[PDB]
């Protein structure tokens, strides 16, 4: 038969299963809601171990539950009161024998120590990967530091000893590949000068490679912790979403950059070269799996400035109408396009994040925290269960790093870009506009021609890449 | 066969905006939503007794990739320019959502509606006077929402869908 | 995109836990923390054909030898590691072959034997007996170092190859 449990009143978590506790969803079982009690008995569950729902729960959690009431629910389901004797046990010592105690030892090694080691589990993944709730309450960490530290018994003493030492050392707190990177490309601007880096005078494969790595550093830095609760939307976004704040801000800036650099070569031939220069870095991009940057790319050819220059856009050939136009289409009809090439290319890439923004916040806005069943209120896991399954999307694609090779100065300059100065964004994006008025008036109004800005060959070395021994 | 309108959805973030959307869309009556699912965000109505097929943006969440405004309303017939009714701030972008409007549809006159969206309790900060006076300045109509009852949502939809139908 | 369940099981500390973040970040870890369950999602193309790698990486420890039904249960492969200067862990691998094969009453489980730390010069199991022991299995044989990479995508894209084909 099934062993036999503590009594639910001396252990709250063995309390008979019941829909007025837990719902299971329509090989093993799949949670819509339950009490928190419910939910970390199955976190820890005797028969089997569950390590997405460990980080699902782990990601989640403070949505429905404190980190230092969680810390309390998994110490009390860690001491587990172990059965008395058996009559048969009984017997056996009233005649002065070693009873058999085989109730009691397959409850401890199919009761206890399962659940132990899944609560010790609990705690490693805690540590590993949200360690955000230790660095934001330092009692937290104490209290957890006091009851890995006191686990009696050998049993879990390899991984409480484990555990202690990965405390310690996320408190302070390399790669390698099967191939060399490639070899950094130079064309006007050669290295060290770095006074003369520009659109046209980086190489345009050098472009599109140093803004991937820094666009990819950029994505792997978001963490969850910036995500769950829609806290990047929030009056304290700032202090609780920098990395991906600053992700996209990045993306804008280059954007704005992109439209500035069109906008500002008011010469109709020289603006050409600079429009085919970004779609050559666009092309670039999309070799590299850049989502990211291919959408920078046709955000600035979508914008209201650029898009209305015809005289520009007749001057462009067909074969880069053609990237350009296949770039866009990843984004129609509701990035149709964009999900099924992310979902079959070979990583390493860097995503478009605002996909994810938009299907989190959705996902918080339009389903309910609590589901009312026989009159109590059970935490809806389902809901908690599909925001974890974006976040968990995002963190497969923060794994694989890019095999490109750094260029520090180059990369200082992309990072230091400013487009806008010292101007609000009003300010400037009416600035482009009225440049973009200024260089193709509207019709009838006559074209007007303008003198050269650039003094150096504006004939692109291409984006095929270059071999010397 | 029936008509298709393409609809954008634009507005201060952080104020419950997602909410308009979700309820027009929703089961009406299960609150529960994937967004994730393809088609979440089309909805075949009945208006003044002629079908037509709903495809609606709303971009909620991506309000700090501003350089994509242009692209994303780019594809719109019709917008819905909402403001949160406690957050005076989200009332006073709504001038300058409709200049961007203007702007990237290069008409003076694109098919809008302004909508004052309830997102809690929270005491009211804009009054339905001052709104409608702004709405009046711009000849649009103005719909108030609940972000909580579905009240208005329908009406904002339809209305605009008229705005399109009447240009 | 095909969904495929790796289970990587052997002896404490012949480096599954290597193996796998190997894999997955390209990064060594040079500490030896023990696991209990840790589980990697993982999008890639093999052989022309993308798909999604859920790998589950069990624990070693003895301590935890009644735990493991549950993980062989959902498994449709296995990497069976033992650690090429471990003579004991080599040993241990029919233990693991004969429990994945009862969980899941088949004579035909998809597996690949994996010989890790192969960067290491003194070794106590001779590639030999291991391949003799792959053959009487029906799988093959990848030598590994978590350390270098050696191996590494051969032994579990190995694995997916065999899962596509039973
Ligand atoms: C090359 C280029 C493009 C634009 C602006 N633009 C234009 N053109 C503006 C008109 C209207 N009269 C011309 C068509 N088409 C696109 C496309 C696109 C292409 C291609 N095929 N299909 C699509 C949907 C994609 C994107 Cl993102 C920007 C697009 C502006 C300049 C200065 C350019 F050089
Ligand atoms: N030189 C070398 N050391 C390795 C290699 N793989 C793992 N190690 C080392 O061996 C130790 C144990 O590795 P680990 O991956 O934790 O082993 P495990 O099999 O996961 N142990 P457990 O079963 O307890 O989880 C670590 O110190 C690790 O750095 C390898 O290929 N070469
Ligand atoms: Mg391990
Ligand atoms: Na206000």
Known sequence: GQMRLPSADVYRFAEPDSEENIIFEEGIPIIKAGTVIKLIERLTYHMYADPNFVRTFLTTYRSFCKPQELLSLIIERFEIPEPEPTEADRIAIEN????????????????????????????????????????????????????????????????????????????????????????????????????????????????????????????????????????????????????????????????????????????????????????????????????????????????????????????????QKKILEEAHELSEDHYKKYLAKLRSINPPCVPFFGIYLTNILKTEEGNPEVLKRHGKELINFSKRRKVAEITGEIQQYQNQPYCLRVESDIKRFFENLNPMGNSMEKEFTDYLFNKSLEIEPRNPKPLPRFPKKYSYPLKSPGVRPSNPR | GMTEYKLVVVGAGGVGKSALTIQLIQNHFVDEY??????????????????????????????????????????????????????????????????????????????????????????????????????????????????????????????????????
């Open chain 2, 34 to 167: 994937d967004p994730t699912i393809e088609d979440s965000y089309r909805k075949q109505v009945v208006i003044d007794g002629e079908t037509c097929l709903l495809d609606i943006l709303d971009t909620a969440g991506q309000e700090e990739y501003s350089a994509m405004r242009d692209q994303y309303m780019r594809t719109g017939e019709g917008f819905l320019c909402v403001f949160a009714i406690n957050n005076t701030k989200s009332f006073e972008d709504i001038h300058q959502y409709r200049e961007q409007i203007k702007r990237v549809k290069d008409s003076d006159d694109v098919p809008m509606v302004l909508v004052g969206n309830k997102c809690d309790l929270a005491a009211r900060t804009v009054e339905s006077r001052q709104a409608q006076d702004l709405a009046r300045s711009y000849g649009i109509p103005y719909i108030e929402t609940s972000a909580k009852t579905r009240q208005g949502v329908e009406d904002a939809f339809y209305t605009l869908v008229r705005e399109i139908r009447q240009h």
């Open chain 1, 96 to 319: 002065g024998d070693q009873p058999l105690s085989a109730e009691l030892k397959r409850f401890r090694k199919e009761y206890i120590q399962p659940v132990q080691l899944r609560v010790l589990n609990v705690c490693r993944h805690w540590v590993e990967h949200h360690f955000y709730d230790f660095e934001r309450d330092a009692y937290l960490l104490q209290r957890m530091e006091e009851f890995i530290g006191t686990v009696r018994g050998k049993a879990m003493k390899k991984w409480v000893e484990s555990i202690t030492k990965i405390i310690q050392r996320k408190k302070i707190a390399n790669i390698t590949f099967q191939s060399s990177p490639p070899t950094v490309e130079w064309h006007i601007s050669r290295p060290g000068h770095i006074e003369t880096f520009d659109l046209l005078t980086l190489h345009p494969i050098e472009i599109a490679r140093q803004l991937t790595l820094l666009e990819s550093d950029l994505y792997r830095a978001v963490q969850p912790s910036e995500l769950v609760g829609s806290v990047w939307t929030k009056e304290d976004k700032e202090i609780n979403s920098p990395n991906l704040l600053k992700m996209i801000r990045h993306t804008t800036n280059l954007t704005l950059w992109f439209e500035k650099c069109i906008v500002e070569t008011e010469n109709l031939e020289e603006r050409v070269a600079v429009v085919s220069r970004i779609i050559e870095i666009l092309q670039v991009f999309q070799e590299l799996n850049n989502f990211n940057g291919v959408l920078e790319v046709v955000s600035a050819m979508n914008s209201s400035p650029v898009y209305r220059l015809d005289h520009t856009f007749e001057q462009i050939p067909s074969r």
